[PDB]
Design a protein around this ligand. Sequence first.
Ligand code: CLA
Ligand code: CLA
Ligand SMILES: CC1=C(/C=C/C(C)=C/C=C/C(C)=C\C=C\C=C(C)\C=C\C=C(C)\C=C\C2=C(C)CCCC2(C)C)C(C)(C)CCC1
Ligand code: SF4
Ligand code: SF4
Lengths: 80, 98, 64, 164, 41, 144
Amino acid sequence: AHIVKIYDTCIGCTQCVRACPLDVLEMVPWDGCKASQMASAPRTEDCVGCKRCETACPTDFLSVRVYLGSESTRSMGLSY
Amino acid sequence: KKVKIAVDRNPVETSFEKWAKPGHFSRTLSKGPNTTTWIWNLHADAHDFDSHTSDLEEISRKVFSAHFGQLGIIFIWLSGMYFHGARFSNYEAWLSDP
Amino acid sequence: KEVGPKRGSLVKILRPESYWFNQVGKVVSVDQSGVRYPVVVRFENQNYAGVTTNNYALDEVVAA
Amino acid sequence: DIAGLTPCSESKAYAKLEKKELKTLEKRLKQYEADSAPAVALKATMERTKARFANYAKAGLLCGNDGLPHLIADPGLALKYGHAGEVFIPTFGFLYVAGYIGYVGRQYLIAVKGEAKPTDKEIIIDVPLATKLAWQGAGWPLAAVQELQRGTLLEKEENITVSP
Amino acid sequence: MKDFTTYLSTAPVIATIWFTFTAGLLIEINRYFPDPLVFSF
Amino acid sequence: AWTVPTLNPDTPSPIFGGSTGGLLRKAQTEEFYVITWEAKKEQIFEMPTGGAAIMRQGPNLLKFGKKEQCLALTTQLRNKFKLTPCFYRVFPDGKVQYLHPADGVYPEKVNAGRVGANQNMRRIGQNVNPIKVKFSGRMMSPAE
Ligand code: CLA
Ligand code: CLA
Ligand SMILES: CC1=C(/C=C/C(C)=C/C=C/C(C)=C\C=C\C=C(C)\C=C\C=C(C)\C=C\C2=C(C)CCCC2(C)C)C(C)(C)CCC1
Ligand code: SF4
Ligand code: SF4
């Protein structure tokens, strides 16, 4: 179970969701941007922490942020 | 004749205009540096001819004339060893007592 | 009124976690709404992601 | 004789090693005719060698237990005993050229930032500009210490930090 | 040939001209001044 | 209008001669994830477990052992071929769970009715220091 917490510096360009290879991220309405959207991580149980989200955030000092927590059989990326 | 000579007359102008602009081969490099990773990606992506363009004909023409460049450098390299074999050697003396 | 600086003025960034802290760039636009970070600043100094622009708040941003 | 040492014109292991080298050159010289260029080269090596020992003893270089020229890198022991040419003269002969290259490279970077895109003129060096700063930077300590007095050498705390 | 002189004014070409200048200067000095270990007069 | 489609395993598999990169014994104990899509025409896609399988017209049923192995299949089924797949999660007690269009709309586009979990109404540069979150039971990041 990794810890993914995003912040208000989000602009809602949803490049983190398109980059997430595990559907950890989704786009929720939020009035603090022109695109009226801010990400959310309802599926951090499935996250591996490969940080493809925060390779893709445009904002300086990345808005999405992944904290490598305790690794279950889904966080280690195991077919076995 | 399915097997036939087929060329294209003058595809590229012989011009020094693109030597003024380093990184001209790639979209990601032609806008100049802002970072020292530019000049390393310049030399890394330089002969990655498959990554410059998508046209297989343009790739093939680039690797065909680059091979003349490698052969042309080998002919300099061979001609060095015959020249350094000629003017700075003991090959005259070596044959009598080898 | 029109909060924020003008359309193309020079500016100094005071966000201590930003890559352009204590560094000078150009405002390109200030969004006139209830957005938390309206002020859009473009730089010549690109960051480690190659992104030359960012949104900043009204208070992390000082003229000249 | 400063720190257990001796002049190389006075020590004997120095002269023994000079005679050691000239022995090795001459037993190498013996394999060739006296007109041959492999012998003309070796006799020219000796006259560069024998003048080298003559010039090291001429300057008063200090030998020791091994008969080699030892250097004294302290002013006050080189100024007092006549050895500033070992270290104390080239420590300013260097630092002229060193800060020269620093100042020319400084002035080229300062005078390129007020442009359209200065990153292009670090690839393509403006040769009429760069050589112009190269010649006129020859009085760089005379220009730096005047810039040192203003406060224009040191940029202030506009410099970039992380979390002070 | 203005574009050709831009190429001669790039970074590696000036580097390989100036390093042949600076080595070639120090090579000629170390020919006409054999083995300068210490600053003589 | 949309809610929670179920599954029948009757739907045909893609024609694939089987690879050694497929399932493992984890499918028989923990979980294995099945994926469905509706193909318009018969064409040739790449298996994420190596090789190439051909899809057939109508429904297509395929099974994997990871979540990335299914979403790296839909990524080349949505971007290349403009299909609309969805993959599930099957447990060895027969239980099944619906995963990827979890509210119907794909997660890049707003649904206006999904709940914004795991967010901080503050800036990442405004975290507390680790001296404040020390002795929090377990070891704990200051972003909590
Ligand atoms: C940092 C370490 C270090 C230091 C201190 C030295 C120091 C020295 N080395 Mg050594 N060396 C080093 C590293 C070092 N080396 C390394 C790493 C190597 C292996 C590559 C060598 C290999 C090596 C060899 C093979 C030899 C030396 C030699 C020498 C001596 C230099 C003689 C010389 O060239 O005078 C240079 C004299 C000058 C006057 C140069 C000044 C430059 C100009 C003239 C001044 C500017 C004037 C003018 C304004 C400019 C004109 C431009 C115009 C446009 C106006 C000196 C004792 C030589 C020697 O004699 O040994 C003792 C020698 O044969 N070294
Ligand atoms: C027929 C010979 C041949 C040919 C045509 C190619 C062609 C290519 N290779 Mg390839 N390669 C070859 C042999 C060959 N390779 C061999 C023998 C190996 C095993 C070592 C590799 C390993 C290899 C890798 C791992 C990669 C390539 C890549 C590439 C592509 C771009 C190369 C480029 O732009 O670099 C331009 C040239 C350079 C940057 C020069 C490199 C500097 C070398 C390493 C220093 C050594 C020089 C010298 C020996 C040392 C002394 C010099 C002295 C000054 C100290 C290009 C399609 C790259 C690619 O396709 O990227 C997707 C890539 O990543 N090749
Ligand atoms: C005598 C001697 C000695 C000693 C010395 C000493 C003791 C010194 C000290 C020193 C010191 C104590 C120093 C300090 C310093 C500080 C600083 C601070 C500096 C600075 C510098 C600068 C700042 C510069 C800059 C620049 C310029 C201006 C020009 C060039 C370029 C550049 C940019 C780099 C010895 C024996 C060893 C050796 C011999 C000689
Ligand atoms: S982080 Fe970058 S990508 Fe993720 S949401 Fe905020 S803006 Fe869109
Ligand atoms: S962490 Fe790895 S998985 Fe979770 S979102 Fe960022 S990238 Fe996708």
